[PDB]
Amino acid sequence: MNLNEYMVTLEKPLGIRFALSADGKIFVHAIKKGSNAEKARIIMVGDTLKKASDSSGGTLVEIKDFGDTKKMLVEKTGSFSLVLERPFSPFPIQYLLHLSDLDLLYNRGRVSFVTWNKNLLSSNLRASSQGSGNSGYAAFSSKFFTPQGWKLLNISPLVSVFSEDVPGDGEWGYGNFPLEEYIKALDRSKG
């Protein structure tokens, strides 16, 4: 049934820049040239990241917010299995090319958020033990909170654009192909 989905195994470095948007979905923002994800031509830009694995492969745990991906990106050596979901319609990387990283931001004016409710803190500041949190955090970037926290505060706006310590100093692009022809085909399709 979930045929838009696909599993890919990548050795570190992953070479993928992820984009946490104000929907809970962790997109793929850019791919480093010459990386393992660059070699694996199936990983596109805008494909949601649904599940992920650990260094030994372990169990293919679902990813809910930045908290799950933090552990994956902290590590530097291993083989990670990633489940990606191709968008129902092709991702308009036209917006990524045109709009600057400041344009596609959720907390542009970094409004402060001090909270003790664990249901508002992302799944790295919860501790999820008995009740609504024990310690409170004062944060300005909306990447430290859940979509419920963002709703309380209030292509979709992105709350963060994160990555890992990918070596090689490869340029962040959108895949190894005639990208100009790809965009021309995209406008031909939509028109």
Binding site: N2, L3, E5, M7, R41, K51, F177, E181, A185, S189
Partner: protein, 422 residues
């Protein structure tokens, strides 16, 4: 019932020029004097986009279709995105565009792969169906651009002379997997075929489906005992009718995966074609493989291998009919003229039962259906079989145009069939 005849594979040379132009005058003049409704032409990918990913040469095709318009014959354009030519004999070869072939060579997983790694270059796989692998374009984008160029060039013909566009969605223009590699004699009739889903670009989706279903062992590969192409259904434990793996949970899961990927490939290309050819007085058709042999077996192993999840327990043509009804597409089916007794009985071939099942599915989904013969035959026996199958067909496509059909007795039989169907 409208009658359509198909132009030979030499309708256009390697260069974009009409082959044997005076001969085509002779043939077409005889055809429209015979009262034939129309004619079916293969718009080849490798003769229009041969060397430039953007340049679309339409010389010979423009001559041919304007010429068919001049003789007042409807044109059924078949968007041939497949390679043909030397498989056992010589015939004539129309390869894929050279840049496409170069892309397939640099990345071998762009072509359908079997269990043992043999790669079929007749068509571009559906594992890389939406990946930008063809000079920065996805295969959907390439096919859509080809259809857009065809529409732009022949816009004055759509709705007036061109009345049907069959979409090439697999080998021989049939929405199927290349489970019959007659090349090098890898498969010979009768047989069951293999599972052409061993690209890693599709094994990725296999792993995704296996993880979604909570079975992190059913996505590693395909069946390990499915059987070689020329093996028999009872020779394989997967396709045996006595409680075989096709009835197990793993068999059901894998076969649903296979059929639904083929259906999703169909969905994508059909949606693209409908968007391109919307509201222009033309119809869109999809050709479906007429897998008559091994019909009597419970598993229907050739159908299972060629992407059709049609068994005695599941009707695999009903979802295809649903798709065609969703996109308002014509169901084109082969193997209409053949009879059960004519085909070998040791292989349990049931062409008439298969045609009946197709008709039932099309009636259930209210999908218009068209038929074509599988082999070229001029006999009144086959003509009467086609007449009965049409009586129960929106149109019929006849294979194949050749001077043999213009002989005395063959021509008389053909025209008799024409005014019998009319």
């Amino acid at each position: 019932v409208p009658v359509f005849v198909m132009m030979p594979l030499d309708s256009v040379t390697m260069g974009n020029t009409v082959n044997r132009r005076k001969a085509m005058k002779a043939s077409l003049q005889a055809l429209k004097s015979a009262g034939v409704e129309g004619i079916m032409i293969d718009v080849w990918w490798g003769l229009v986009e041969k060397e430039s990913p953007g340049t679309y040469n339409w010389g010979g095709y423009n001559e041919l279709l304007e010429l068919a318009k001049k003789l007042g014959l409807k044109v059924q354009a078949v968007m041939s995105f497949h390679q043909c030519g030397g498989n056992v004999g010589d015939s004539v070869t129309i390869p894929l565009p050279q840049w496409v072939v170069e892309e397939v060579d640099k990345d071998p997983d762009l072509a359908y792969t079997d269990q043992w790694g043999r790669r079929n270059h007749e068509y571009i796989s559906l594992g890389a169906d939406t990946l930008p692998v063809l000079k920065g374009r996805t295969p959907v984008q390439c096919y859509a651009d080809f259809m857009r160029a065809f529409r732009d060039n022949f816009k004055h013909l759509l709705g007036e002379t061109i009345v049907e566009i069959q979409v090439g969605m697999g080998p021989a223009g049939e929405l199927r997997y290349p489970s019959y590699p007659e090349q090098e004699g890898t498969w010979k009739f009768p047989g069951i075929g293999a599972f052409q889903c061993y690209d890693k670009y599709s094994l990725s989706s296999l792993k995704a489906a296996a993880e979604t279903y909570g079975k992190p062992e059913w996505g590693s590969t395909g069946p390990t005992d499915a059987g070689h192409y020329n093996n028999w259904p009872e020779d394989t434990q997967f396709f045996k009718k006595e409680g075989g793996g096709w009835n197990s949970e793993y068999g059901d899961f894998f076969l649903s995966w296979y059929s639904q990927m083929l259906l999703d490939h169909g969905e994508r290309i059909l949606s693209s074609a409908k968007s391109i050819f919307e509201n222009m007085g033309v119809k869109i058709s999809v050709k479906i493989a007429g897998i008559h042999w091994h019909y009597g077996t419970r598993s229907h192993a050739p159908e299972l291998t060629a992407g059709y999840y049609n068994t005695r327990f599941r009707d695999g043509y009903l979802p295809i009919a649903q798709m065609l009804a969703r996109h308002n597409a014509i169901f084109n089916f082969t193997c209409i003229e053949m009879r059960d007794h004519e085909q070998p009985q040791d292989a349990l071939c049931a062409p008439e039962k298969l045609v009946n099942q197709v008709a039932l599915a099309t009636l259930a989904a209210e999908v218009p259906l068209a038929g074509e013969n599988a082999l070229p035959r001029y006999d009144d026996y086959a003509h009467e079989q086609i007449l009965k199958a049409s009586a129960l067909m929106c149109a019929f496509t006849y294979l194949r145009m050749n001077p043999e059909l213009f002989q005395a007795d063959n021509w008389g039989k053909f025209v008799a069939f024409v005014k019998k169907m009319g």
